[PDB]
Design a binder for this molecule. Structure first.
Ligand SMILES: N[C@@H](CCC(=O)O)C(=O)O
Lengths: 41, 340, 376, 49, 50
C-alpha cells in the first residue's frame, strides 16, 4: 500500500496561509483605524 | 548422520550416530534426530514427540525516543519568522493605539509576548479600537500555531517504525540480498542440504554460503555483537537460546515441518511398542509439562513493539534552554540595575 | 467432508461427470434404507489437500483407487467394543484404507495402523476478538520518571533563585507564592499572584511558561501516540484458569463445548471428568452451527483440532474470530493416512510422504489450500 | 473576554458577581476547551495522513 | 489542577485517536480479495450473461 511516512518539517513554503491571514488582519486593522480617524473628522 | 561415499571401495556407508546404530553396538536413538526420506531408508523411525523447524533469529533492542531536540518539528527560519512577526505586530499595536483618539509600548509588547506563549505577566491590553480588532486575530494566530505544533510533533512521534522485522521466507531475503544485513547458516548441515535442494533455495544458499559461518555458538555470539545479523538453524535450539538470555528474540514462521523422533533399529518389536508409548505420553500433559519445565524457563518476551516513551534525553534541549534563560536573567538583573 | 481438506462437489453439469482438475469420488451410500443393494452411486467429486496428496502418491507409487465415500456411521469412536465410520470400515477389511482427517491417536493406533504425520494439529481454543483495552497507567506511561523529578528539581531551584536574587536585589513575593505560581503555570492555570515589576523575574516567568507549554505539548503528543498504538494480549490457556476447574468463579455461562464422537471429546473424557461434564452440559451442534452460535454471542469459546480452527479463523474476513496467543497446541499428534493392519504398503507410502516433504511440494500445497485472509 | 477565552487566553476583565453570567462564562469555556481539543485532534489526524 | 490537566490531555488524545483509526472503505484491490475466496450476502459481484 506504500504507507505514507510523513516525517517532514514545516518550512515557510509548507505553511504560509497563517501569515497571509495575519497580514490580511493587519490590513483590516489599518483601514478600520483610517475609517475611524476619518469618521471623527 | 552421513551417507559418505567414496571410490576407494565403491560402497557408501553410514558414519556417526546412525553408523554406530547400524553397526550393531547401539540399540536406539534417543537424541533429537530429524526425519527425512534419506535416513528412513536404512532404519525406521517412530511417532514424533515434537514439531521443530527453521526460524530466523534477530537481536532485539528497546525502541528509543528518536527526537533530537525540541526545535525539530518546524524549522529554524520558522521560529525566526514568528519572532520577528511578534515584534512587528507589537510595534504595530503600539502605533495603532497611540495614533487613534492607552498601551505604552512596553506594556503592549509584554501583552503580545505573553499571549503567544500562553501566559506570563503584564496586565494591560489595548484600548484603541484599531488594536482591539488587531489582537483578537493575534490570539487566533497563536492558537493556530500551538495547534499545528502539537499535531505535527505527534504525527512525527507515531510514524516512526524503524524495525521492519523479517516476517518469514517471502521477504527480500529471498528476492535479493544486500550489503546492509547478512544471512547464512552453518556449513555441512541438514539446512544447507535442504537449501541446495530446491531451485530458488539454491540461489539463496549460494548467496548465503558466499559468507557462511561454520559454528552455532560463534554465530550466536556474532549476532549478540552485531557482527552477523541473522542465521537460520533448528527451531528448538534458538528458541531455548532466546529465552535464556532475554536479549534476542525469534522471528518469521516455521515452514519446514520435520520433527524429531526416536530412532529404532529395523524390524524390532520395541519400535511399535515405542510408538504406542510416545503417543500416549503426548496425550497426558507429559510432553507439555516437560516443555514448560525444561526448555521454556520464563516468558521474557515483552514483545509487540511497545510505543516510544519520551526520555530525559530529548527534553535535555529544553532544560539547556531554561538554564540559558536563568543565566540571561542573572545578567539582565545587573543590566537593569545599571540602567535604573 | 467434515474438514476443509476434501470437499464434496456434486457434479459438473456440462460433462455429465466431474470436472477436469479434481478426482471423482463415487458415493456408495444408502440414500434412505438398506432394503436392497442399491448403492445410490452419484458421480461426486472430491477436491482439496488430501485428494492432491493421494494423486501425488498415485503418481509416485503406481496404483489404482476407488473412493468408498463414507460408511455414514461416525467419524470414528469405540461403541460397545466396535469401531464405526472410517475406522469401522478399515477394521472390517471393507475398504483396506482411509484418508482425510483421522488425527492419529493411541486408541486408534491400537487396532489400525498409521503412517507418519504430514500436518500438525492439536487441541486449541478459538475465542472472539474482544473489544480493545488499554493499560491502567496510561496517564503516567508517556513520560519517564526522570523527566518528572528533573522538572521538579528545576522548578524548585528556579523559584528559589528568582525569589532570592530578583526580589530583594531589584504584598511581597515569598517562596510559597512563587512555587504556587509556577505549579499553576505548568498545570493549566489556576490563580496565582503576578510577580512584581522586576524585569528579570518577568523574564524568568516567561521562560518558565515557555518550558511549561512545551512540556504540555510534548506530554499530549506522546500520550496520543501512546494511546493510538494499543492492543490486547490473549485468552488465558487451555488447561489453566481454575474458573475452568470451577465454573462458579464469575459468569458461570462461560460457554464452551465440543462436537461429540471426536478426538478432542475422547481426550477430554480420558483426561478430565468435571471439565468433560461441564462441556457436555453446553454441548453444541456441528462445526458450522457451532461457529454460528459463537459469532452470535450465544457461545464464548470452542474446542476443535488446530488445523480446521486455524483455517476458519484465518479465512474469515473481519478478523473477528481468532485463536489464543500466536497459536499454541496442547495435544499435538498430527493427521495421517490410515492403513490396513499388517499391510506391506506402509513403508512405500511412508517413503513417498517423506520424499514429498523433502521436495517442498506440501509447502506449496499449504498456500494452495490453507492460507487465509487474516494473515496480515 | 469570550474571544480570548476561546483562543488560548489573552487578558480579559472578569465578569461581575452575577451568578448567571458566571455560569454562562463557564459553559462557554467548556465549549471552548472542547472546540480546541477537537481542533487539535482532527488536525493531528489530518497531518498524520 | 494536575488532575484537570491529565483529564484534558487524555480527552484530546482519545478523541484524536478515534478520529484517525476510522477507515470504513476497505476498497477491493484486485482479484486476490475475498471475492475470490468466498462470497457473502452483504455485497454482490457478477457480469452480463453471454
Ligand atoms: N478429527 C477429529 C474430529 C475433530 C476433533 O475432534 O477436533 C476426528 O476425526 O474424530
Amino acid at each position: 500500500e506504500k504507507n505514507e511516512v510523513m516525517s517532514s518539517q514545516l518550512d515557510i513554503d509548507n505553511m504560509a496561509g497563517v501569515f497571509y491571514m495575519l497580514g490580511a488582519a493587519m490590513a483590516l486593522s489599518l483601514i478600520t483605524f483610517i475609517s475611524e480617524h476619518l469618521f471623527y473628522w | 548422520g552421513t551417507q559418505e561415499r567414496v571410490q576407494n571401495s565403491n560402497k557408501k556407508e553410514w558414519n556417526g550416530m546412525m553408523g554406530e546404530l547400524l553397526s550393531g553396538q547401539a540399540d536406539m536413538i534417543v537424541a533429537p534426530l530429524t526425519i527425512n526420506n534419506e535416513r528412513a531408508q536404512y532404519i525406521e523411525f517412530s511417532k514424533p514427540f515434537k514439531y521443530q523447524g527453521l526460524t530466523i533469529l534477530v537481536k532485539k533492542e528497546i525502541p528509543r525516543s528518536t527526537l533530537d531536540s525540541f526545535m525539530q518539528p518546524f524549522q529554524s527560519t520558522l521560529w525566526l519568522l514568528v519572532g520577528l512577526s511578534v515584534h512587528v505586530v507589537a510595534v504595530m499595536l503600539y502605533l495603532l493605539d497611540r495614533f487613534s483618539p492607552a498601551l505604552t509600548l512596553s506594556s503592549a509588547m509584554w501583552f503580545s509576548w505573553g499571549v503567544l506563549l500562553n501566559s506570563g505577566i503584564g496586565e494591560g491590553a489595548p484600548r484603541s479600537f484599531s488594536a482591539r480588532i488587531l489582537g483578537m486575530v493575534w490570539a487566533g494566530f497563536a492558537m493556530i500555531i500551538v495547534a499545528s505544533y502539537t499535531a505535527n510533533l505527534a504525527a512525527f512521534l507515531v510514524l516512526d517504525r524503524p524495525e521492519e522485522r523479517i516476517t518469514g521466507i517471502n521477504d527480500p531475503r529471498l528476492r535479493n540480498p544486500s550489503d546492509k544485513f547478512i544471512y547464512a547458516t552453518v556449513k555441512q548441515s541438514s539446512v544447507d542440504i535442504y537449501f541446495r535442494r530446491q531451485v530458488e533455495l539454491s540461489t539463496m544458499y549460494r548467496h548465503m554460503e558466499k559468507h557462511n559461518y561454520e559454528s552455532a555458538a560463534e554465530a550466536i555470539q556474532a549476532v549478540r555483537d552485531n557482527k552477523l545479523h541473522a542465521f537460520i538453524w533448528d527451531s528448538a535450539v534458538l528458541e531455548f537460546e532466546a529465552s535464556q538470555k532475554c536479549d534476542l528474540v525469534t522471528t518469521g514462521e516455521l515452514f519446514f515441518r520435520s520433527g524429531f523422533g526416536i530412532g529404532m533399529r529395523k524390524d524390532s518389536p520395541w519400535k511399535q511398542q515405542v510408538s504406542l508409548s510416545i503417543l500416549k505420553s503426548h496425550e497426558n500433559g507429559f510432553m507439555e509439562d516437560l516443555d514448560k519445565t525444561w526448555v521454556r524457563y520464563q516468558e521474557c518476551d515483552s514483545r509487540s513493539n511497545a510505543p516510544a516513551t519520551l526520555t530525559c534525553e530529548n527534553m535535555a534541549g529544553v532544560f539547556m534552554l531554561v538554564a540559558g534563560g536563568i543565566v540571561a536573567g542573572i545578567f539582565l538583573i545587573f543590566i537593569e540595575i545599571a540602567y535604573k | 467432508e467434515e474438514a476443509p481438506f476434501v470437499i464434496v462437489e456434486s457434479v459438473d453439469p456440462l460433462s455429465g461427470t466431474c470436472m477436469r482438475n479434481t478426482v471423482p469420488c463415487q458415493k456408495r451410500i444408502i440414500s434412505e434404507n438398506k432394503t436392497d443393494e442399491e448403492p445410490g452411486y452419484i458421480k461426486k467429486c472430491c477436491k482439496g489437500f488430501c485428494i492432491d496428496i493421494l494423486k501425488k502418491i498415485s503418481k509416485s507409487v503406481k496404483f489404482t483407487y476407488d473412493l468408498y465415500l463414507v460408511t455414514n456411521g461416525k467419524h470414528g469412536k469405540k461403541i460397545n467394543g466396535t469401531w464405526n465410520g472410517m475406522i469401522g470400515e478399515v477394521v472390517m477389511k471393507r475398504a483396506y484404507m482411509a484418508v482425510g482427517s483421522l488425527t492419529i491417536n493411541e486408541e486408534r493406533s491400537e487396532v489400525v495402523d498409521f503412517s507418519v504425520p504430514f500436518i500438525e494439529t492439536g487441541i486449541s481454543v478459538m475465542v472472539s476478538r474482544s473489544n480493545g483495552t488499554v493499560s491502567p497507567s496510561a496517564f503516567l506511561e508517556p513520560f519517564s520518571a526522570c523527566v518528572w523529578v528533573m522538572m521538579f528539581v528545576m522548578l524548585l531551584i528556579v523559584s528559589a533563585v528568582a525569589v532570592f536574587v530578583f526580589e530583594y536585589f531589584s504584598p511581597s513575593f515569598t517562596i510559597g507564592k512563587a512555587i504556587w505560581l509556577l505549579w499553576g503555570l505548568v498545570f493549566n492555570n489556576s490563580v496565582p499572584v503576578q510577580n512584581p515589576k522586576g524585569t528579570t523575574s518577568k523574564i524568568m516567568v516567561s521562560v518558565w511558561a515557555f518550558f511549561a507549554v512545551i512540556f504540555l505539548a510534548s506530554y499530549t503528543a506522546n500520550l496520543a501516540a501512546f494511546m493510538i498504538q494499543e492492543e490486547y494480549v490473549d485468552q488465558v490457556s487451555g488447561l489453566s484458569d481454575k474458573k475452568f476447574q470451577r465454573p462458579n468463579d464469575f459468569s458461570p455461562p462461560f460457554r464452551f463445548g465440543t462436537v461429540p464422537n471426536g478426538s478432542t471429546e475422547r481426550n477430554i473424557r480420558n483426561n478430565y471428568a468435571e471439565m468433560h461434564a461441564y462441556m457436555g452440559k453446553f454441548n453444541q451442534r456441528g462445526v458450522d452451527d457451532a461457529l454460528l452460535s459463537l459469532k452470535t454471542g450465544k457461545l464464548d469459546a470452542f474446542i476443535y483440532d488446530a488445523a480446521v480452527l486455524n483455517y476458519m479463523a484465518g479465512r474469515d474476513e473481519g478478523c473477528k474470530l481468532v485463536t489464543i496467543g500466536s497459536g499454541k497446541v496442547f495435544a499435538s499428534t498430527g493427521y495421517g493416512i490410515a492403513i490396513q493392519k499388517d499391510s506391506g504398503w506402509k513403508r512405500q507410502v511412508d517413503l513417498a510422504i517423506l520424499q514429498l516433504f523433502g521436495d517442498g511440494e506440501m509447502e506449496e500445497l499449504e498456500a494452495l489450500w490453507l492460507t487465509g485472509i487474516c494473515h496480515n
